Amino acid sequence: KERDMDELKKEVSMDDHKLSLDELHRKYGTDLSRGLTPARAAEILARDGPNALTPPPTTPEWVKFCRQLFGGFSMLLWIGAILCFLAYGIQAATEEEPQNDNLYLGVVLSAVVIITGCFSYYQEAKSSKIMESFKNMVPQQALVIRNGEKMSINAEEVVVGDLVEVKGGDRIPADLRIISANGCKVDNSSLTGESEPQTRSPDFTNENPLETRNIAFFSTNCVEGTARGIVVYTGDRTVMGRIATLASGLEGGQTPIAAEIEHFIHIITGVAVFLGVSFFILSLILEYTWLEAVIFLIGIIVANVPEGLLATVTVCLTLTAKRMARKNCLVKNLEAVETLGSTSTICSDKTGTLTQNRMTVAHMWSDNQIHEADTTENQSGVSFDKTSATWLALSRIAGLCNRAVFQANQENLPILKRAVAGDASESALLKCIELCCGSVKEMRERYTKIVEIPFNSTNKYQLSIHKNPNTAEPRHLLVMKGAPERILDRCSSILIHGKEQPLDEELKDAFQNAYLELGGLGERVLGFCHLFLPDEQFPEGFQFDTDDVNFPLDNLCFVGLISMIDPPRAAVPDAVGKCRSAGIKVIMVTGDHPITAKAIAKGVGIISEGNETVEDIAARLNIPVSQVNPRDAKACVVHGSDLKDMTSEQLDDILKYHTEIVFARTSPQQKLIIVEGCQRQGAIVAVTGDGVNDSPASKKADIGVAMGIAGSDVSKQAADMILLDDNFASIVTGVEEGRLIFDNLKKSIAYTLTSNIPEITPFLIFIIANIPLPLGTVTILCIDLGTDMVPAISLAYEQAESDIMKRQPRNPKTDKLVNEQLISMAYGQIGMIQALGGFFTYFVILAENGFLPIHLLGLRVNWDDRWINDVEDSYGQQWTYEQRKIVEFTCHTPFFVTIVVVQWADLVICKTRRNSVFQQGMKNKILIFGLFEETALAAFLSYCPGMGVALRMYPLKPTWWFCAFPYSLLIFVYDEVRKLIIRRRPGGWVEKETYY
Amino acid sequence: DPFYYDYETVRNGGLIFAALAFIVGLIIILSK
Amino acid sequence: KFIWNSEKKEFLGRTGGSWFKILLFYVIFYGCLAGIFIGTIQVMLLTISEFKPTYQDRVAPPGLTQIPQSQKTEISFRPNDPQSYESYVVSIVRFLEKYKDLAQKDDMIFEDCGNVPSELKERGEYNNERGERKVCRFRLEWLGNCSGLNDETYGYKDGKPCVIIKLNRVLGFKPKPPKNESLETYPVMKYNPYVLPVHCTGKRDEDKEKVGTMEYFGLGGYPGFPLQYYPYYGKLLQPKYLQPLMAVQFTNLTMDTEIRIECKAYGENIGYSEKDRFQGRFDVKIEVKS
Ligand SMILES: C[C@H]1O[C@@H](O[C@H]2[C@@H](O)C[C@H](O[C@H]3[C@@H](O)C[C@H](O[C@H]4CC[C@@]5(C)[C@H](CC[C@@H]6[C@@H]5C[C@@H](O)[C@]5(C)[C@@H](C7=CC(=O)OC7)CC[C@]65O)C4)O[C@@H]3C)O[C@@H]2C)C[C@H](O)[C@@H]1O
Ligand SMILES: *[C@@H]1O[C@H](CO)[C@@H](O[C@@H]2O[C@H](CO)[C@@H](O)[C@H](O)[C@H]2NC(C)=O)[C@H](O)[C@H]1NC(C)=O
Ligand SMILES: CC(C)CCC[C@@H](C)[C@H]1CC[C@H]2[C@@H]3CC=C4C[C@@H](O)CC[C@]4(C)[C@H]3CC[C@]12C
Ligand SMILES: CC(C)CCC[C@@H](C)[C@H]1CC[C@H]2[C@@H]3CC=C4C[C@@H](O)CC[C@]4(C)[C@H]3CC[C@]12C
Ligand SMILES: OC[C@H]1O[C@@](CO)(O[C@H]2O[C@H](CO)[C@@H](O)[C@H](O)[C@H]2O)[C@@H](O)[C@@H]1O
Ligand SMILES: OC[C@H]1O[C@@](CO)(O[C@H]2O[C@H](CO)[C@@H](O)[C@H](O)[C@H]2O)[C@@H](O)[C@@H]1O
Ligand SMILES: *[C@@H]1O[C@H](CO)[C@@H](O)[C@H](O)[C@H]1NC(C)=O
Numbered sequence A: 001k002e003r004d005m006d007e008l009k010k011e012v013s014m015d016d017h018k019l020s021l022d023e024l025h026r027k028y029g030t031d032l033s034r035g036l037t038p039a040r041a042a043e044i045l046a047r048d049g050p051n052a053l054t055p056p057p058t059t060p061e062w063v064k065f066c067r068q069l070f071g072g073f074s075m076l077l078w079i080g081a082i083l084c085f086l087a088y089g090i091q092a093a094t095e096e097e098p099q100n101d102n103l104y105l106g107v108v109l110s111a112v113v114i115i116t117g118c119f120s121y122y123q124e125a126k127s128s129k130i131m132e133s134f135k136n137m138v139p140q141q142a143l144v145i146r147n148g149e150k151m152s153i154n155a156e157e158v159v160v161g162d163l164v165e166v167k168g169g170d171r172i173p174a175d176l177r178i179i180s181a182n183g184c185k186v187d188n189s190s191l192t193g194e195s196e197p198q199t200r201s202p203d204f205t206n207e208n209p210l211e212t213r214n215i216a217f218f219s220t221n222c223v224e225g226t227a228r229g230i231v232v233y234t235g236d237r238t239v240m241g242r243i244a245t246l247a248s249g250l251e252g253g254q255t256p257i258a259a260e261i262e263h264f265i266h267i268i269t270g271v272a273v274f275l276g277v278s279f280f281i282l283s284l285i286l287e288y289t290w291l292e293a294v295i296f297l298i299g300i301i302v303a304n305v306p307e308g309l310l311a312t313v314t315v316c317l318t319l320t321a322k323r324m325a326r327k328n329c330l331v332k333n334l335e336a337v338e339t340l341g342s343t344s345t346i347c348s349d350k351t352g353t354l355t356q357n358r359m360t361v362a363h364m365w366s367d368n369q370i371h372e373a374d375t376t377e378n379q380s381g382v383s384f385d386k387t388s389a390t391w392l393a394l395s396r397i398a399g400l401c402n403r404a405v406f407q408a409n410q411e412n413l414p415i416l417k418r419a420v421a422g423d424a425s426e427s428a429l430l431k432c433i434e435l436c437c438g439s440v441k442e443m444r445e446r447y448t449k450i451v452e453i454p455f456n457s458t459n460k461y462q463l464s465i466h467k468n469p470n471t472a473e474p475r476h477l478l479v480m481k482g483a484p485e486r487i488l489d490r491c492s493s494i495l496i497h498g499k500e501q502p503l504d505e506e507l508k509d510a511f512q513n514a515y516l517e518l519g520g521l522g523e524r525v526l527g528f529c530h531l532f533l534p535d536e537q538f539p540e541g542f543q544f545d546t547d548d549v550n551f552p553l554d555n556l557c558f559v560g561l562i563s564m565i566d567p568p569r570a571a572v573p574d575a576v577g578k579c580r581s582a583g584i585k586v587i588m589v590t591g592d593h594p595i596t597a598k599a600i601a602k603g604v605g606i607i608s609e610g611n612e613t614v615e616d617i618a619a620r621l622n623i624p625v626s627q628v629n630p631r632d633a634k635a636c637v638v639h640g641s642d643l644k645d646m647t648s649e650q651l652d653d654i655l656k657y658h659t660e661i662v663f664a665r666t667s668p669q670q671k672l673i674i675v676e677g678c679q680r681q682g683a684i685v686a687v688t689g690d691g692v693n694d695s696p697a698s699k700k701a702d703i704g705v706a707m708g709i710a711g712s713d714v715s716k717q718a719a720d721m722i723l724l725d726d727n728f729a730s731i732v733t734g735v736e737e738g739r740l741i742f743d744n745l746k747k748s749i750a751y752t753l754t755s756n757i758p759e760i761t762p763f764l765i766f767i768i769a770n771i772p773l774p775l776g777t778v779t780i781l782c783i784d785l786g787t788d789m790v791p792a793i794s795l796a797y798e799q800a801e802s803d804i805m806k807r808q809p810r811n812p813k814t815d816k817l818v819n820e821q822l823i824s825m826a827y828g829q830i831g832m833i834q835a836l837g838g839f840f841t842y843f844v845i846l847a848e849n850g851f852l853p854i855h856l857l858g859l860r861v862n863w864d865d866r867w868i869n870d871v872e873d874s875y876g877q878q879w880t881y882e883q884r885k886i887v888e889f890t891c892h893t894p895f896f897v898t899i900v901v902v903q904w905a906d907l908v909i910c911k912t913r914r915n916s917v918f919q920q921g922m923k924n925k926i927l928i929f930g931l932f933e934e935t936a937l938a939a940f941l942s943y944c945p946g947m948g949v950a951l952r953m954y955p956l957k958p959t960w961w962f963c964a965f966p967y968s969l970l971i972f973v974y975d976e977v978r979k980l981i982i983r984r985r986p987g988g989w990v991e992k993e994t995y996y
Numbered sequence B: 001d002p003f004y005y006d007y008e009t010v011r012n013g014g015l016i017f018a019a020l021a022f023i024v025g026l027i028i029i030l031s032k
Numbered sequence C: 001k002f003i004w005n006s007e008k009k010e011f012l013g014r015t016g017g018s019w020f021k022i023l024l025f026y027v028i029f030y031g032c033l034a035g036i037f038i039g040t041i042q043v044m045l046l047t048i049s050e051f052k053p054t055y056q057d058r059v060a061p062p063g064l065t066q067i068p069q070s071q072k073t074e075i076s077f078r079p080n081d082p083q084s085y086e087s088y089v090v091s092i093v094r095f096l097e098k099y100k101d102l103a104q105k106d107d108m109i110f111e112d113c114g115n116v117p118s119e120l121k122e123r124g125e126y127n128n129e130r131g132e133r134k135v136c137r138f139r140l141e142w143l144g145n146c147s148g149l150n151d152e153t154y155g156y157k158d159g160k161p162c163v164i165i166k167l168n169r170v171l172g173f174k175p176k177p178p179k180n181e182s183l184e185t186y187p188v189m190k191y192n193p194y195v196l197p198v199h200c201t202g203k204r205d206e207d208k209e210k211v212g213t214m215e216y217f218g219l220g221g222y223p224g225f226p227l228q229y230y231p232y233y234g235k236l237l238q239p240k241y242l243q244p245l246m247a248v249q250f251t252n253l254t255m256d257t258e259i260r261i262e263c264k265a266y267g268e269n270i271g272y273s274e275k276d277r278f279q280g281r282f283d284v285k286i287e288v289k290s
């Protein structure tokens, strides 16, 4: 009944959070001031379980090796081997050759499966290892209060319903109901997705326990202030514990590439059993007993199986994944490398994914003008004009009044990514001034702070007074920052270009509308003001304290506003631009507040400029929001409150009829529902995320993508791909790479599949026309696994035949990896020419040695007879067994060599699906080496001493080598004019029938 | 006699070839 | 759906609108492929000589063969049961059915050679400038007590085992017997110049189980092949060509035990392979059980 459990886990949560503290403690049986008794604490601690999450339920043993050994393809090779062993077992009905033949073959198949499995396993294992190196868990001991006494204990020993105090920097030990607070801002960024630190208070605010201020949450750090609360939830019963357990309990789903390979297998086995059965019937129709007919059936069916293609495919994927790793894009699973290329929809998280999740100075107000700062992580943007003195004054104000200072070990670090002790805004301002205006060290210690007023519980104005560094005016300098409206209430004079003024309502309301414009932009704005002091009235020795009014808190000089927000990562906007350019639909899914969500959306290009939401239309036209027709709105910001009341058809409609979509204030479960909703459309969905709220989403997605550093642990475990450098642009590279490796795969496949016609046909007409066997088993293996390997791998290094990021995402139903047209080429056309070349070489050799082709018919019966030592050729000569057999085996080697020769042409034409070879070209080096090494290998096998003893391969009389040549040239010319006509006529009959 | 072939010479030729072709391939994949 | 697509409006499974197009294309295509193949095979057939094969080097050490080619080199039979030796007997009958005196009637295509081994008969060159070559006669009387005409055996070894050995036919081959300087060739006649010798032994070079007494029938009484029947000019220039035969009778043997016999033909033009037991030499296991 775990179905019901996961059904309760996909539902958004509920709480007791709204209670009189009297009723709270009445329910939980606790003292608010004194907590509860140690006896009771230890009683509850052993009553259920310690406070911590149950370790991930998944701990698969290295026996998971077996996983790599089956899949769908390795399975095909397995049943191949099994059939071989069965065939040899049937050949135990007599005294039989397969000691070198069928047993050999089955064992070889087994070997391929096992080895490839070993390789892939080692790769995934390696990724898992480098991932393990990244896990660091530091014990953080909670501060409890029991029997009235404050005691700091291991966080795992915390129980339900006992008093807990959290301080600045402290991580919240378990889920709490805040009874009391002072200036307390907790950071909910990872859990609910709220960007800026949310304050916490005793009072009940919002009905939804996630947005309310009287609840503090597990795994969240308290940014500032202090708070006391009773523990509502402990361990797995907590919020992120439920999220985590939901994440652990979801399903991966079948990756697109795996499905394509499954279908491919269906094709291959299809023609396998068709040939096998039809030829079984055919064989019975002539002479051969059910014994022979069965052996032939197994023979053909197994023969149709591509042994080496497992290796080549695995290696292909591994190579691409290698490049991915080079770019600091790590893939947990090997087949997940493709998925991006098949993705038509990207659901992205906002904070920590699309953005930096770091409060940063955005815009500044100087001389009634807005100057945008550089918000990028790497400082790749444009610096403002700092020549003006107004900026100097402002920067000194922001730098001098703060609690913000750099910590001990931040020097060598970049000024942005380096750590800072202080508030959000204070951190942002500190970094900004340290960046643009130079160091705030000698600058803040230049002016000596006398008496300061920290942010007040009411009106939140923060002022401080310093002495004068300047050599002209020895006046005391006063500085204050605070909310724009209150500081507007307390300010009179305004400063411009280094000289003062009073306030006129024109530029005062210019300031007002500038403040409302920047505030509407999603940013948080702070008023900055200063005043010189009348040092005649306040002498150099005057000590002013905080008691009475020392300074004229009114008639001050208002300087400007400094606004701040968490900016998108530097690489993000361009990335979203490319993804949109490739035809991928970008959807923003965040639990953050709508007002900021829409702004960031318009910023990163998820919502393009000029596209109006329903509400934008309603606002412009001065109309009730209900009136306007939703069809007229291309973009929409969907509120999470509504998403709870929404049905399947409704969500389907929202996703269908809106091009640019932002879901805001969405619970993790709802992220899951959105992903599933995009999957109901039958589309491939990729999810990019940062925090734990993306755990159920990233898991459910066809491919999940985490952030290597800014990402949390649970969502990192749930992800099928990790970005170690945290570069969003990588996603673009991804969808490029995966879209390329698709095409190349086809080529590789095609190549190998072409070889099976000239491989199988010798054993076919061996049965039919009763000629001596043209091509042996060892030779066939020397082609499949011996030679073609290096070319088939080299085909992976093929490049883009056109601009791929231009074309739309593939259709999973329509466009296939291996489809009708491929088979119709490889099996139908090219492979046939190959087979003909092979048989031609065969007849050349046998005719030159005294057996004319016409005479070779029906001969095999006596030919394969060991004991007939007088065998008449066309010249009347008598051959023994070993002599004519040596000729047959020296007919195997050239057939093999011929396969290589035609595989030259096949390799060059498989290089390009569309372009003529004189366009795309031979610039592939691995391919060249493929040809060279291939030819050299064949020549070696033929001419190496003792090879006729070992592999029963004999030295080719050299002119044999040229028999295959005209067939290779034919293959080349033919596919070249095919890839000409396809280019010239893109109707097209050749394009519809052949192009694959 | 027609019944004697030089197999050792052809053998040598093929092997020499294999060596040259392979090391040339090696020159090719290393482009510096 | 997904798959039931066998027939609907309007496609034959799978898609049947254009089937004529593609079928025609493959008829044309495979037709042209076939044509090209037959072309290459035709030039290839233009490059082969109608008289001599282009490569003789594979058969170079001709082999020694037996009349009653057995399942594996073995004659095991009962001296009593008529059906015991019937297979062997019939094989011999059909083998020597070609050699009977009324089988060569024609003085047109047949030629009577010496009653004593003679020098090789060289006829012109291997082209067709000369007419179809005559073939030297071989009369079954040259083998006494083994298939000699009517009188005896006729049980064809029924009392005691006998097998005729034959040399493999090779076009242009002119056997050179070992020199009169020959190294330890064991009992044999002085007719070494014009005959190609053959001798039998129980086990090759090592300790033997050896039980045997062997009587040989050659041309004129010499245990070998007369050089006068060589060289062989091929099936085209010499159809109905009869190659030399030589009989070996085992008189004295241990009946109910199986022993093995190897017959080696000696010469410079002759050679032996260790991998091919039938190349230049001969192997037979015989058990006559009663
Ligand atoms: C009473 C009389 O009985 C009389 O017994 C007969 C009967 O039992 C009939 C009995 O037929 C044979 C004969 O047709 C020869 C026939 O021999 C062929 C079939 C078996 C082969 C071993 C062999 C060599 C190629 C090999 C096939 C088997 C396939 O599975 C392959 C592994 C397969 C591959 C898969 C892949 O991926 O790569 C290639 C395709 C080709 C293949 O490589 C050829 O194998 C058949 C089984 O031959 C016996 C001698 C004897 C006396 O006459 C006696 O008087
Ligand atoms: C072949 O066998 C016949 C037997 O029919 C041999 O004639 C016997 O020869 C021996 C001497 O070896 C005489 O003692 C017998 O009296 C003969 N009997 C008969 C019925 O002829 C004949 O000599 C043998 N010939 C050869 C060449 O082996
Ligand atoms: C661009 C085309 C022609 C590429 C093909 C290269 C051909 C011409 C090469 C590749 C393999 C080569 C052969 C390898 C084996 C040797 C054996 C030696 O004893 C005689 C020549 C001979 C037979 C070589 C002749 C040239 C050969 C047939
Ligand atoms: C050039 C094309 C398009 C036209 C047709 C020419 C073909 C038929 C030619 C080109 C190369 C030729 C072959 C090269 C190798 C020799 C091996 C030799 O031992 C017998 C003939 C044989 C097999 C040749 C026969 C004809 C051949 C196959
Ligand atoms: O045709 C492939 C072959 O062409 C080369 C050299 O011949 O490059 C040619 O084609 C390129 C087009 O991309 C151009 O560099 C130019 O036309 C010409 O050099 C090789 O790159 C390749 O092996
Ligand atoms: O193509 C002619 C070229 O091939 C050679 C070997 O290099 O041919 C030799 O080996 C061939 C094997 O089939 C024979 O056909 C040929 O008779 C033999 O000379 C050389 O002749 C020549 O350089
Ligand atoms: C034939 O062999 C037997 C026993 O094997 C022997 O007694 C007899 O003497 C032999 N005949 C001869 C040597 O003529």
Ligand SMILES: [Mg+2]
Pocket (backbone or CB within 6 Å): A252, A698, A699, A700, A701, A702, A703, A704, A718, A719, A720
């Ligand atoms: Mg997954």
Ligand SMILES: [Mg+2]
Pocket (backbone or CB within 6 Å): A189, A190, A193, A349, A350, A351, A352, A353, A689, A690, A691
């Ligand atoms: Mg986030």
Ligand SMILES: [Mg+2]
Pocket (backbone or CB within 6 Å): A303, A305, A306, A307, A755, A756, A759, A784
């Ligand atoms: Mg194959």
